[PDB]
Write a protein that binds this ligand. Sequence first.
Ligand SMILES: CCCCCCCCCCCCCCCCCC(=O)OC[C@H](COP(=O)([O-])OCC[N+](C)(C)C)OC(=O)CCCCCCCCCCCCCCCCC
Ligand SMILES: CCCCCCCCCCCCCCCCC[C@@H](O)O[C@H](CO[C@H](O)CCCCCCCCCCCCCCC)COP(=O)(O)OCC[N+](C)(C)C
Ligand SMILES: CCCCCCCC/C=C/CCCCCCCC(=O)OC[C@H](COP(=O)(O)OCCN)OC(=O)CCCCCCC/C=C/CCCCCCCC
Ligand SMILES: NC(=O)C1=CN([C@@H]2O[C@H](COP(=O)(O)OP(=O)(O)OC[C@H]3O[C@@H](n4cnc5c(N)ncnc54)[C@H](OP(=O)(O)O)[C@@H]3O)[C@@H](O)[C@H]2O)C=CC1
Ligand SMILES: *P(=O)(O)OCC(C)(C)[C@H](O)C(=O)NCCC(=O)NCCSC(=O)CCCCCCCCCCCCC
Ligand code: SF4
Ligand code: SF4
Ligand code: SF4
Ligand SMILES: [Zn+2]
Lengths: 176, 337, 96, 208, 114, 62, 144, 156
Amino acid sequence: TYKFVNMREPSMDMKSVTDRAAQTLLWTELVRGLGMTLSYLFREPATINYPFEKGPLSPRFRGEHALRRYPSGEERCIACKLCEAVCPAQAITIEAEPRADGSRRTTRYDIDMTKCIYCGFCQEACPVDAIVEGPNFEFSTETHEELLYNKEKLLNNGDKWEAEIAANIQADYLYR
Amino acid sequence: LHHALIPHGKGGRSSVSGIVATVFGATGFLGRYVVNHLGRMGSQVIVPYRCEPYDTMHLRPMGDLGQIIFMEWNGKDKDSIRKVVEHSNVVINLVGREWETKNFDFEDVFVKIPHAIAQVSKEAGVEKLIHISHLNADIKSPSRYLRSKAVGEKEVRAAFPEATIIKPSDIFGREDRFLNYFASMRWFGGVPLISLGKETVKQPVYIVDVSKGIINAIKDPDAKGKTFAFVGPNRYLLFDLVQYIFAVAYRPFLPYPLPHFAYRWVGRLFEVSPFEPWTTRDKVERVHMSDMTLPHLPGLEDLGIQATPLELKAIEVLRRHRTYSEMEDVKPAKTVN
Amino acid sequence: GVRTSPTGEKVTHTGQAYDDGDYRRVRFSDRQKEVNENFAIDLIAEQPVSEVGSRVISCDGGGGALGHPRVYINLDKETKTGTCGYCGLQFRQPHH
Amino acid sequence: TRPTIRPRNDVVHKQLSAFGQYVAEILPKYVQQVQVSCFNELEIFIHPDGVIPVLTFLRDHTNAQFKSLADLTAVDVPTRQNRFEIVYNLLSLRFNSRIRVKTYTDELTPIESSVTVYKAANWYEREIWDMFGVFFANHPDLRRILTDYGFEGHPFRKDFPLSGYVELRYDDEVKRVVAEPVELAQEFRKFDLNSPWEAFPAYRQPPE
Amino acid sequence: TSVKPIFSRDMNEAKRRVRELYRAWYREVPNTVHLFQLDISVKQGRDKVREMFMKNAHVTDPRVVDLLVIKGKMELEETINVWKQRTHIMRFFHETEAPRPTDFLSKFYVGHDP
Amino acid sequence: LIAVDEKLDITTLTGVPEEHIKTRKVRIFVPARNNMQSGVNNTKKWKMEFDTRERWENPLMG
Amino acid sequence: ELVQVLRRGLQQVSGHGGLRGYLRVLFRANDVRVGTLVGEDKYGNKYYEDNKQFFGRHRWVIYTTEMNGRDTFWDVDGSMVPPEWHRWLHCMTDDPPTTKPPTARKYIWTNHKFNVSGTPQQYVPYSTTRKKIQEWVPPSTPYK
Amino acid sequence: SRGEYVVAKLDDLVNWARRSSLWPMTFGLACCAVEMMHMAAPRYDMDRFGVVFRASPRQSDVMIVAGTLTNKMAPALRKVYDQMPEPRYVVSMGSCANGGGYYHYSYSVVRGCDRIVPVDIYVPGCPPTAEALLYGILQLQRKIKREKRLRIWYRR
Ligand SMILES: CCCCCCCCCCCCCCCCCC(=O)OC[C@H](COP(=O)([O-])OCC[N+](C)(C)C)OC(=O)CCCCCCCCCCCCCCCCC
Ligand SMILES: CCCCCCCCCCCCCCCCC[C@@H](O)O[C@H](CO[C@H](O)CCCCCCCCCCCCCCC)COP(=O)(O)OCC[N+](C)(C)C
Ligand SMILES: CCCCCCCC/C=C/CCCCCCCC(=O)OC[C@H](COP(=O)(O)OCCN)OC(=O)CCCCCCC/C=C/CCCCCCCC
Ligand SMILES: NC(=O)C1=CN([C@@H]2O[C@H](COP(=O)(O)OP(=O)(O)OC[C@H]3O[C@@H](n4cnc5c(N)ncnc54)[C@H](OP(=O)(O)O)[C@@H]3O)[C@@H](O)[C@H]2O)C=CC1
Ligand SMILES: *P(=O)(O)OCC(C)(C)[C@H](O)C(=O)NCCC(=O)NCCSC(=O)CCCCCCCCCCCCC
Ligand code: SF4
Ligand code: SF4
Ligand code: SF4
Ligand SMILES: [Zn+2]
């Protein structure tokens, strides 16, 4: 089906001609626009009082990256490099070697936050839920270098945001 | 050499040149050019600064990620000097000032600070020390500027025996105070000259050539404790040089003779400005002083740099001062040579 | 187990510390070196050893789907304890 | 029923096969091959010199009113003698259908421009030239469209490096942007992902 | 063996087109210098045009010559219409690149590159 | 249809620098079968690759 | 009526604890709305809720005047909130941390830190791996 | 010292005006520009902070590089940055402006606008949230609050 949007010939009778002439001489539609703008002026603004008020978010929100630990304190990452395999932007660099106790653990884990596109593929591919996208989004820096996170920075982020990240994962782990 | 100081790459922006250089007074003309060249070659530059961090913004694109490090230092603080020269194998000294402030004098900026920098660098294990001096450096010079430069050169040589003392004659460039000073004197009516400038001979040198010579001196192993003299290929009379500058700038050129005492009084008048002064008595003395000839000292040709004549690079500096750009040919100025 | 290197620099959990002659320590001047204080190896060593009465025991890291893939560990060799290698957890069979 | 397998339209497949036979019979001088894919797409492989006649016929014929040029692109296959493969996608609104015309061309062989038949061919052929080096003989204005001015090389060729040869940065000495040989802080990491086991027996090639 | 031509049937027409392109580029150097406010001289521009023309002097296939002159005409068209900036015109003159030595001893000293 | 006996040289048209045109030795080979696997599907097409050049470590982040 | 609005404004003036409190909340928060207090963290931030406001303005935080070693009377950041109150304020849940305390772990930070960019505490990257190739140390004994 | 007190108070006064009144020139090159429109939208209202919606390069103090900077576009960005009058600040918004983003290894992308202009603030994200960009702007404002131009000048 279809419809016409601008195919409607106006009537040529004297009443309609006089109405259109009055519309031309007396700015009726312009007055209508003014009235609409006045109504919007008297409406209530939709502005939040940032930073004292924050816009709504979701548990699925992707922000600053973090590396988690087990409740026992052992870090969850097992140096499997699915991160590096699946990262679209190749922003993850991983180097691993056997630990002093023989565990398979990372020695280098770097994320270039200036190269990452915050797509969330790394936390989908983790078999142990080690790397996550934390809810933080206010980590702006004054230098380019500060956005080149390493393993220590990511572990600090995980320890700092562990409560909120754990709550979000608990709330939204049944949809995955 | 340290395992991390071994050069790598093709000498680009992302390569390692093996040079860790602390550059004093990098927030200036020659310091800016030297930092640019070091960033081009891929070195690790440490920039001690005392001014606002906003004024150091132009030095950030010159280096790659993490190559340029900005640290706050104090001129009268050997602790800060050690902090900024602790991890560098090259130290470059370019601190200077055309005038004197209420807290720093010519002796303070040319004798005390360079001596402390040289002294701390020797105790910090710095391999190479480049110190910038002036070609017309003499203990009995009329100007306190040149007297203090000579005294500081002697003190730095005594403190750091394996030093390279570089003595440019007078540097002209985009941000120089030589060509900009000469071309901007049109405000004071006609251009004032002492004896019309027909008895003063100058040999100017390009900023790029000076920076390339400084860079080559670091890499060359034969310049460990030497003293160079960077001069241009041609020597010009002051009157002819100013006439050529005004011809290139397409400005009306009317020179008038001014007595020496009158010119010194005029320079004294401008010194009262709390801001940067247009001219000073020492600057007038240096402008009307001749350029010393030192054939014994090696130069740009010895370092492998061919000096650029002023005729080629004059249009870059003086195109800004044109008012109409004016697209007319300018005859080269005759050189005494 | 944060230990200080001879140059007065903290050593990370990966045994990272710049040498005395390394120029790269200049980046930490007037700034700080980011080191995580908690060491996972030390914490997992502090964790005790669970004893169960079976030859094969299953570990999923706790929490079910929030842990690691479920693995089965054979508690036969009495010389050592069977270690789940995802979480690094030790299980043992009673002896005395 | 099979929920996870896409349905098949034998009626549309037969219609496309019949139309392919029709056009092949009508134009024996240029049509080299006719194919119909299993997802109901008609492909006509023609000689490179019959581009204008074939497109004019497929635009103006009463039973073949493909008035709309959907797309125009090229594919670079280095192993072939004629590496470049110009593809025309045509849309017929009268019969609600799409057709695909294929042509082969090497580096030094020009092709007749289709700006006379379709007007979108102007910019499409400009882009093809800019990105591959394929030259179109009768183009009103052929020049680079996407690449930077003075750019050397054709990026979409399979022999052109991903990061190119030069990069841009601001040089304070000259007070302008300069072009210097590329030098990556971190090299692009090439991943070998192809499995050593054959996945589709239907496309297996003869052992040669 | 036998191929279709682009513009020239043989090498004489290709050489004629090369001469026409050289004339067109030669007559445009002072205008390019004036419009872009380049710091180079007209002689340097003429020498650079000569050098660019002389680096393809070993080409013997007429089709390659035709493509080269087509690309040269495109580049001249970009310059005349001031579509490019001073940036590209100076990109023709390698000015910020360090002089790479071409001797075995220096290449051995600098690194592993052949 | 002109006649020519040239060897189809597109060196001046590719746009590659003369350094990377004249100082590069490529290897035309069929890749060897990976010993860790028994599949032979990756040893059917010829591969052309260039010679390995220098790769150093970034001063920052290594 | 206008009288009712004026009375509401006067009540808001009285609701902040007189005139000094009203002026303080006006100048350092740019809003003088009053809402029920939900809780307070260990740093001094006070979290208020008022469900009568439209979505996005029904929860807010008044920041403390001093956090860690920095005077934050005027310079207040959005990163000064602890993670649990951060989740509550950003509305990922309807449960305040007082009602639903977060799970306690031995590795979770006890003291929260804001963005430390531009400060001596800023993060500086470095390589976390050891040297790849060990060089050969020459013997310390002369051969002749 | 009375002189020290006066220069400190004048520095506080001058920095307050620049911090409160920001007139940014939006260099919207790609998808990151949409988030700037959403920051200017009624919900966040960048105008209420003293940050004008848009301004010409001559009257602008902050350049917000939001988008992928290509080789064909870098000279124009440098030209407008030069045309901006000092004091001038740069906020690089998004991964493309910060580094290379999704197009880091492309032949036609400048890997970071910091290779062309000195960047004052880096805002991470793809695209950064409107709240993230507002936080970056407020961080720039607090950075301006720490400027000590007159204090440095008086101690020269
Ligand atoms: C109707 C009113 C109309 C006018 C309204 C506006 C005027 C009133 C408000 C003015 C506020 C001051 C603004 C000045 C500019 C500051 C920013 C600036 O431009 O900085 C750049 C420069 C910074 O200097 P700089 O030399 O460090 O610059 C760095 C180097 N470059 C140039 C490369 C960037 O500011 C100055 O130079 C200003 C210095 C002079 C101003 C006065 C400062 C000292 C005041 C106290 C003196 C002593 C008092 C006690 C003793 C008295 C004895 C009598
Ligand atoms: C036409 C030309 C006009 C000339 C006018 C000349 C008169 C001078 C102008 C005076 C304007 C009023 C003074 C500045 C108002 C300060 C407002 C105050 O609230 O700012 C504080 C900032 O205070 C700072 O410490 C600086 C104080 C301002 C400067 C005062 C200087 C002393 C008065 C002027 C003295 C002039 C020199 C006298 C020498 C003898 C805190 O605000 P803020 O920073 O946003 O942080 C809160 C952020 N929020 C809103 C999101 C929560
Ligand atoms: C100060 C009080 C404020 C209260 C009002 C609030 C603000 C209202 C302002 C809203 C106006 C919006 C801006 C208007 C800008 C555009 C105005 C406009 O378009 O008017 C042009 C309009 C039509 O132009 P077009 O249709 O585009 O041309 C096509 C012709 N076929 O032409 C006009 O001249 C408008 C008419 C103005 C004069 C009206 C006079 C009416 C006739 C007077 C008859 C009485 C004669 C007196 C003799 C009496 C004998 C007893
Ligand atoms: N330029 C010329 O014409 C010639 C110069 N020279 C010499 O070369 C050297 C460099 O000259 P040039 O760059 O042109 O001059 P500038 O005045 O432009 O640069 C001087 C540099 O030293 C710093 N500086 C000045 N005073 C002090 C101080 N008290 N404490 C700390 N840092 C200070 C300045 O930093 P800040 O921003 O804090 O002021 C600036 O970075 C000088 O020694 C000069 O004598 C020799 C021959 C010719
Ligand atoms: P006679 O016919 O012997 O002439 C001698 C040569 C060697 C030219 C012969 O004609 C000859 O046999 N040449 C070999 C084939 C040939 O003609 N090659 C030339 C290729 S055309 C070409 O390369 C033109 C493109 C160059 C464009 C240059 C761009 C200008 C740069 C200017 C930069 C700065 C200007 C301000
Ligand atoms: S979010 Fe996407 S682009 Fe970013 S690190 Fe994860 S996989 Fe890579
Ligand atoms: S996917 Fe998980 S276990 Fe694998 S490397 Fe990434 S964080 Fe580690
Ligand atoms: S950072 Fe992401 S959202 Fe921003 S311009 Fe790049 S691709 Fe677009
Ligand atoms: Zn387990």
